[PDB]
Design a protein around this ligand. Structure first.
Ligand SMILES: O=P(O)(O)OC[C@H]1O[C@@H](O)[C@H](O)[C@@H](O)[C@@H]1O
Ligand SMILES: [Mg+2]
Length: 218
């Protein structure tokens, strides 16, 4: 049986992928780049703060100074941090709280594999911190999503091999990161965004321990 579940946060635990999108789109438009629509944003989900900004600059073949780059990433983060202040337990996605409880009752480890430096603050906003056996610090890994390092680190922090773990993700980058870690991915979202080659569920209510077992058994 699997021995750990490795959680993405944004778009899996709560709807903060929407806030990252809105914030990045606002930033892009401030600098005259209009191409960050929902379709483009599928390329940004799961991607680090700096890599996200660089993808937006590349979309436009735009070059900025190092000083401006740093200011822009900070500007987006300051806006995003203001957006999430009122996140509460009521914003936890359906199924997720019960899943955490069920996992703990069945002695399955719980680790956060989020790229977001805002992850710990968000788990505290949602009263979820006490469910987690570990939070992998995204500043400690040498390579960010789609590299597998953060999933590998999450699994290590809880003493479980990646091959005996399930990863939950809403993003193309993150699904690839789970694949290359050796964990089993279960995606949440549209198959047209996330692919036809892994198990995908349409919403997080589908993330029950019963289903994770159903999937693990094959
Ligand atoms: O800027 P932060 O909070 O460190 O987040 C890094 C990222 O964290 C990921 O969880 C999000 O999917 C991305 O959209 C994002 O850019
Ligand atoms: Mg995500």
């Amino acid at each position: 049986m699997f021995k750990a579940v490795l959680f993405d946060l944004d778009g899996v635990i709560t709807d903060t992928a929407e806030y990252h999108f809105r914030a990045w789109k606002a930033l892009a438009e401030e600098i005259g780049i209009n191409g960050v629509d929902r379709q483009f944003n599928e390329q940004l989900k799961g991607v680090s703060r700096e890599d996200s900004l660089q993808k937006i600059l590349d979309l436009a073949d735009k070059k900025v100074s190092a000083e401006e780059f740093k200011e822009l990433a900070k500007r987006k983060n300051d806006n995003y941090v203001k957006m999430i202040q009122d996140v509460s337990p009521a914003d936890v996605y359906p199924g997720i709280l019960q899943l955490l409880k069920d996992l703990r009752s069945n002695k399955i480890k719980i680790a956060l594999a989020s790229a977001s430096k805002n992850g710990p603050f968000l788990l505290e906003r949602m009263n979820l911190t006490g469910y987690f056996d570990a939070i992998a610090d995204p500043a400690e890994v040498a390579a960010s999503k789609p590299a597998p390092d953060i999933f590998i680190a999450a699994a290590h922090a809880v003493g479980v091999a990646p091959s005996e773990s399930i990863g939950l993700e809403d993003s193309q980058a993150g699904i690839q990161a789970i694949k290359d870690s050796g964990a089993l991915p279960i995606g949440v979202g549209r198959p047209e965004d996330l692919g036809d080659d892994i198990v995908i569920v349409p919403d997080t209510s589908h993330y029950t321990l019963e289903f994770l077992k159903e999937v693990w058994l094959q």
